[PDB]
Design a protein around this ligand. Structure first.
Ligand SMILES: *[C@@]12=NC3=[C]C([C])=C([C])[C]=C3N([C][C]([O])[C]([O])[C]([O])[C]OP([O])([O])=O)C1=NC(=O)[N]C2=O
Length: 108
């Protein structure tokens, strides 16, 4: 299947993105100059379910893995359905260093 991949830096408090695959930009229409160093939430919009967004917010705070189905928006405003799976990467001392996300456009 067609998927995308990003890396969030958990040492910084708001989990900014530090790496995105070629597909992530092409899927969403944002360039690296407007993605890197920002929280992934810029992809959200009016129809994003705040109950689902809360599920990721909690999991990141707890440091667990999570999977949600969010409504996102490209740079041109058009919506797409992003199945998102976040995964915590821990150092050997249990501390969370990075979060990693796989995004799949499941508008079908
Ligand atoms: C986003 N992908 C994504 C990828 C990673 C690795 C992480 C950690 C988060 C995301 N998000 C969610 C966003 O960063 C944030 O965690 C949530 O908005 C909830 O937190 P807040 O503080 O806003 O309540 C992704 N969100 C998307 O909408 N699309 C993704 O591709």
């Amino acid at each position: 299947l067609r998927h995308t991949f990003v890396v969030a830096d958990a040492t910084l408090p708001d989990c900014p993105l530090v790496y995105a695959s070629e597909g992530f930009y092409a899927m969403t229409g944002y360039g690296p100059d407007e993605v890197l160093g920002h929280n992934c939430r810029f992809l959200q919009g009016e129809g994003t379910d705040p109950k689902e967004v809360q599920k990721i917010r909690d999991a990141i705070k707890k440091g667990e893995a999570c999977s949600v189905r969010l409504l996102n928006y490209r740079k041109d405003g058009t919506p797409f359905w992003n199945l998102l799976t976040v995964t915590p990467i821990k150092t050997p001392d249990g501390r969370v260093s990075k979060f990693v996300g796989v995004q799949v456009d499941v508008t079908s």
